[PDB]
Every structure is written in C-alpha cells, then in structure tokens.
Scaffold this active site. Sequence first.
Site, mmCIF file in Angstrom:
data_model
loop_
_atom_site.group_PDB
_atom_site.id
_atom_site.type_symbol
_atom_site.label_atom_id
_atom_site.label_comp_id
_atom_site.label_asym_id
_atom_site.label_seq_id
_atom_site.Cartn_x
_atom_site.Cartn_y
_atom_site.Cartn_z
ATOM 1 N N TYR A 132 9.716 2.368 1.486
ATOM 2 C CA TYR A 132 8.349 3.004 1.499
ATOM 3 C C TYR A 132 7.623 2.130 2.413
ATOM 4 C CZ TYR A 132 7.073 -1.045 -1.565
ATOM 5 O OH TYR A 132 7.081 -2.214 -2.098
ATOM 6 N N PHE A 142 -0.418 -2.564 3.648
ATOM 7 C CA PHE A 142 -0.261 -3.682 2.774
ATOM 8 C C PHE A 142 1.005 -4.016 2.103
ATOM 9 C CE2 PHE A 142 -1.616 -0.037 0.442
ATOM 10 C CZ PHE A 142 -0.565 -0.032 -0.521
ATOM 11 N N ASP A 143 1.763 -2.948 2.266
ATOM 12 C CA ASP A 143 3.164 -3.206 1.707
ATOM 13 C C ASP A 143 4.134 -2.337 2.375
ATOM 14 O OD1 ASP A 143 5.204 -4.481 0.121
ATOM 15 O OD2 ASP A 143 4.736 -3.055 -1.798
ATOM 16 N N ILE A 160 2.693 1.776 -10.624
ATOM 17 C CA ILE A 160 1.495 2.230 -10.857
ATOM 18 C C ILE A 160 1.659 3.923 -11.262
ATOM 19 C CG2 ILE A 160 0.205 0.493 -9.445
ATOM 20 C CD1 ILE A 160 0.157 2.527 -7.283
ATOM 21 N N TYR A 186 -4.901 0.379 -8.599
ATOM 22 C CA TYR A 186 -5.601 -1.048 -8.986
ATOM 23 C C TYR A 186 -6.976 -1.033 -9.050
ATOM 24 C CZ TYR A 186 -0.530 -2.094 -7.098
ATOM 25 O OH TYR A 186 0.711 -2.352 -7.090
ATOM 26 N N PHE A 202 0.916 6.180 0.450
ATOM 27 C CA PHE A 202 2.214 5.731 0.639
ATOM 28 C C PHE A 202 3.231 6.974 1.161
ATOM 29 C CE2 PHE A 202 0.789 3.198 -3.347
ATOM 30 C CZ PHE A 202 1.606 1.914 -2.887
#
Lengths: 210, 210
Positions: A132, A142-143, A160, A186, A202
């Site tokens: 992902y 960010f990821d 999440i 978040y 995502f």
Amino acid sequence: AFKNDDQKSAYALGASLGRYMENSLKEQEKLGIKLDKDQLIAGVQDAFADKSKLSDQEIEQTLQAFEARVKSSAQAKMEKDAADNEAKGKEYREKFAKEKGVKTSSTGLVYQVVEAGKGEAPKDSDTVVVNYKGTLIDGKEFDNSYTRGEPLSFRLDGVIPGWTEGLKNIKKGGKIKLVIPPELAYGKAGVPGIPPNSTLVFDVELLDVK
Amino acid sequence: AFKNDDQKSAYALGASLGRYMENSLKEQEKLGIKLDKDQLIAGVQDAFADKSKLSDQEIEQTLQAFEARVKSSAQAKMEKDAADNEAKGKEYREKFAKEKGVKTSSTGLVYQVVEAGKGEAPKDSDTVVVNYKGTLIDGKEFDNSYTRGEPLSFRLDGVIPGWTEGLKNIKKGGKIKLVIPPELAYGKAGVPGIPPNSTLVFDVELLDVK
C-alpha cells in the site's frame, strides 16, 4: 578519535544535547519561530562555564514567556489546520465520490474497487497481507510499504476503521483505492506525519487473507 | 545586550540546558565519574552542525554503556560508604560505651539513662509518646520532633528495634540517649537522610506510656 570513556561518553552526551536542540528548532520552525542559533549555543557554552549573562530569575521568566509563545502558536495552528483540513477533505471526497466506479459507504468511506480479487470475504479477525501507499489529499506520501521492502501483515481489526471497512470490499488478489475521512482515521488529533482532520488516500493491493 | 526575544529566549534556553548538563556532571562527580568537559562541548557543537563524530547508532550505544557505568559506580559508592560508616560508627559506639553512666546491652545497643522516670515499664504492644532528636554520629540532625511542635506517638514494637529495646530501659517521665548500631536501625540500605550502615544518636524524652 577518543582516548578513553571519559572522552567518548562526554562527546556522546554532548552530541545528544546538540541533537535535542536541533530537533527543538525543527518543531519551532513549524510555527514560524526561528531562534537565534548562535545565541542558543552561547547560552549552553556560558552556562557550562558558569558565566551566564542572565540571572536565574531572568532565565526562568524568559523561558516561561517563550514556552507560552510556543504553545499559543501551536494551538492556533492546530485550530486552523484542523478547520482547513476538515473543509478541504470534505470537498475532496465529495468530488471523488461522483467519479465513475467510485462508491460511498453508509459510514462515509469513499472507495474505488480496482480489482475485485477472488476468495473469501475478509473478516475482522483475519490476517491480511498488503502492499500500500498512503498519501494526503495534496499528494504528500506519509506511508508506503514498498519503502520498507515487504508487504504489511496485520489483523484486519487492528488498523484504522476505514481500512477495516474498506478491505472487506475486495478479496485476495484485489486492489482498492480508499479515500478515508478523518472520522474513520486519525481524527482531529492526527498522528506524526498526519495532520489534524486529514483525509487519507490509500492505494491498496490485497495479497493474502488468512 | 539582547536586542530581541529570538536572541534572548534562545540564550535562556541554551543556558537552561547547559545548567542541566552541568548539574548532571555534578551528580556523576559524586560517584567518581569526571567526564571531559571539552569533549562534551565539542559533541554539542559537532551535532548541532550535523557533523557528529558519532552516528546516532554510536551515540546510543555509547550512552547505554555509560548508563551501566554510572549504575555500577553508584553501587560501588554505596558499598564504600557502607563500609566506612560501619567502621566509624563502631568506633563512635565503643568510645561512648566506656563513659560514665553508659551501658551496652546484649544486642549491642548503647544507652545512657538520664532520668529513670516513674511508672510502668513500656511493653511491646504499648503506645509510647516521645519527644526526641536524632543525629548522625557527625552531628547532622536527621529528625527532631520538637520542631514539629508535638511529640511522636507510636506502638513500641512498630519501629526500629533500637527504639523498641531502648525505651524499655526507662519509664514515663524519663529521658535516655540511645546510640543505635545500623543492625538495630536501617542497616546497610539506610533510608532517605540516613546513609548506609549509620549508627544513630537519639536524645529521647518519654512522655507517656499507654
């Protein structure tokens, strides 16, 4: 380089302080606060040599005011960012949700199944394995599992809510794009890397369900 | 000569940090560890400039090793203080014990009745009410009931053995000086305000037995 521990350990202790200061400057810069670095170092050197140009009261009061300035700035920024991100995020999701092949769930999750996959419907207690990429609505990544060099493996109910819900919409071998409201992510607080009220985008590839 | 807050606050911040560092080295000094201050400042400078001679990994490894040195040194100081205090106390007790009016009990408690008092002898389950002053053999006062404006009340066998035994040697209205070996007090560990293996000197006035 170092003759003994009284040298090496000192140096290490010092470097650790230097690192701490640099890190502090970095958080301050986020708030537009740019301290005079030469003065920061001189205070350290002076104090360490017992020759501070400021009295103990002056230090205490000056720090008190500074810490209030910082927290005040930090809070206004959080307040502004939160409001702005909630608005921009809603706009973003609203637009995307209208596009061909994109769906909106009863929770507000917006998703686009790219490849359905094949197999069992994923459930909360399952272990899923995925590749992902996560980015903010402005494109800031960010990821990213790819950068760690292996897919992420986790219990579906251990992530999440937007993920727990979204991955159920495909099966093993599938791919889905998830556009997740902060309420299923978040929220207002956010986490390091993810600002308050951020909508997360995502791109997910579901490799295994076990 | 600070022209603005960005100068003044930076200096104060550095000074606070340098003082923190100085204080840390002071504590280390008490344990026999005297780090090289020049290297400590070089580490601060080098890291602040992103040119540390130690990587983050090396800094951490060095500091973990240093923490173990520190704890090892702390234990060493304890042991040394324990031995030194045992020797000094034994010497103090032996000299005092030979003086007119002083007695040594079977347990090694050394005591001097000043006033016998009159009434019933304090027994194990009794409550006693006392005024007292407690000093280390060097004269350092560690406890003084008078300053609290009231006598201390406790069950005779609910305190250190030296007190439990000692007070049985007088009666209500009496006064006794107790010179208590660490074995009948706080022993090798000590407690806050009482170093390892401290012989304790108590001047006691027994007000009531009930």
